[PDB]
Amino acid sequence: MAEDADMRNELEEMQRRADQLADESLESTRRMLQLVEESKDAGIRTLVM
Amino acid sequence: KAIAHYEQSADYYKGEESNSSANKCLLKVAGYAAQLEQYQKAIDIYEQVGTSAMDSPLLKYSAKDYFFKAALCHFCIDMLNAKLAVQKYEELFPAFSDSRECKLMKKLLEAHEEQNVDSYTESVKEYDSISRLDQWLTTMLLRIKKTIQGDEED
Amino acid sequence: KAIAHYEQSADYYKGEESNSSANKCLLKVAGYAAQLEQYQKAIDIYEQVGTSAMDSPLLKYSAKDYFFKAALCHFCIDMLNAKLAVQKYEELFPAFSDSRECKLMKKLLEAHEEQNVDSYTESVKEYDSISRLDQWLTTMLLRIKKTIQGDEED
């Protein structure tokens, strides 16, 4: 031999990102954490009143 | 004279301390102080009635509605009283109908302070996407939008 | 003196089976009395309301916050006395609204008992969003963490 090979290689990016907006789905599921608590919080105390 | 009798009768309902009868009178006063256009008195009404409401669980989830009703009553009131009445009324700004008041109001009155109506009109519909607008609000919004527009020419 | 007025007046309302004010004025006694000075009255009142609350088919859903008020009053108590109410009370813990009563508690008991603060405080970091906190709840939050201070603060 008396052989040195030092090499590099390249990447294939994974799928599932047609557009970044997809993470806005998380902004949705934030909102259905946002839009859920006050329903019961006023529901049970609406039963109280 | 209708308004003078809502106000006079609310004085009587507060005479016997029957509060929300007077507040139902005060919306017909104050809500019709918008189209009679005395905004200075519109914001003089929702303060003393709604800061009295955070102690009440009876209306607290409603009280921030009233300090949207206090807040959006502009005659172009660009003081930080609008940035402070939202604070004296202690109000978690990550409240999720105050997201529909406070940071709503930030986009509504920063763009006026940007002098830029376009993202204003896009974000008011973004509010419409998450809470649909009604008559008194929508009329005062086109009103203040006139003020914003007539300020952005000059 | 006003709490004595509520007390004797609720004694009259009790002796007339006007159960409304009978429970109510007692709640006015205990909600301020516990924080300021009277401790066994707190659970005794919120259990007297809680039993007949569990009784009626109208009342047994108001009992959830009533035993919340019985539990979260800690009387310089480090213990699971709230959990004594858990394995007492008819929770039916697949009703999750009592998990905002006791799974809250099932965290914070061992947070206060392992003298830990970043789990105790985290409970309200997450619970402030899913329940708006009034003055009495946050004063009791500060109360149990004064017990945490007395456990930690040298």
UniProtKB/Swiss-Prot annotation, chain A:
Q: How is it modified after translation?
A: Palmitoylated. (Microbial infection) Targeted and hydrolyzed by C.botulinum neurotoxin type A (BoNT/A, botA) which hydrolyzes the 197-Gln-|-Arg-198 bond and inhibits neurotransmitter release.
Ranges in a coiled coil:
none
Q: Where is this region: Disordered?
A: 1-23
Query: What is the protein's quaternary organization?
Result: Part of the SNARE core complex containing SNAP25, VAMP2 and STX1A;this complex constitutes the basic catalytic machinery of the complex neurotransmitter release apparatus. Recruited to the SNARE complex following binding of the SNARE complex component STX1A to STXBP1. This complex binds CPLX1. Found in a complex containing SYT1, SV2B and syntaxin-1. Found in a ternary complex with STX1A and VAMP8. Interacts with HSC70 and with SYT9, forming a complex with DNAJC5. The interaction with SYT9 is inhibited in presence of calcium. Isoform 1 and isoform 2 interact with BLOC1S6. Interacts with CENPF.
Q: According to its UniProt record, which protein family does this protein belong to?
A: Belongs to the SNAP-25 family.
The entry's function note states: t-SNARE involved in the molecular regulation of neurotransmitter release. May play an important role in the synaptic function of specific neuronal systems. Associates with proteins involved in vesicle docking and membrane fusion. Regulates plasma membrane recycling through its interaction with CENPF. Modulates the gating characteristics of the delayed rectifier voltage-dependent potassium channel KCNB1 in pancreatic beta cells.
The protein depicted here goes by the name Synaptosomal-associated protein 25
Give the shown range, full length included.
1 to 49 of 206
UniProtKB/Swiss-Prot annotation, chains B, C:
Main localization is membrane
**Family (UniProt):** Belongs to the SNAP family.
Q: Where in the cell is it found?
A: Cell membrane
What processes in GO biological process is this protein linked to?
A: apical protein localization; brain development; intracellular protein transport; membrane fusion; neuron differentiation; positive regulation of ATP-dependent activity; protein-containing complex disassembly; regulation of synaptic vesicle priming
Carrying Phosphoserine, the residues are: S56
Q: How does it sit in the membrane?
A: Peripheral membrane protein
Keywords, comma-separated and alphabetical: Acetylation, Cell membrane, ER-Golgi transport, Membrane, Phosphoprotein, Protein transport, Transport
The protein's name in its UniProt record: Alpha-soluble NSF attachment protein
Name the Gene Ontology molecular function terms of this record. protein-containing complex binding; SNARE binding; soluble NSF attachment protein activity; syntaxin binding
Q: Name one GO cellular component term.
A: glutamatergic synapse
Q: Which residues of the full protein are shown?
A: 140 to 293 of 295
Q: How does it assemble?
A: Interacts with PRKCABP, and disrupts the interaction between GRIA2 and PRKCABP, leading to the internalization of GRIA2. Found in a complex with VAMP8. Component of a SNARE-like complex that contains at least ZW10, USE1L, RINT1, STX18 and NAPA/SNAP-alpha. Interacts with VTI1A. Interacts with STX12. Interacts with GNA12 (via N-terminus); the interaction promotes CDH5 localization to plasma membrane.
Whether Transport counts among this entry's keywords is: yes
Any idea what job this protein has? Answer: Required for vesicular transport between the endoplasmic reticulum and the Golgi apparatus. Together with GNA12 promotes CDH5 localization to plasma membrane.
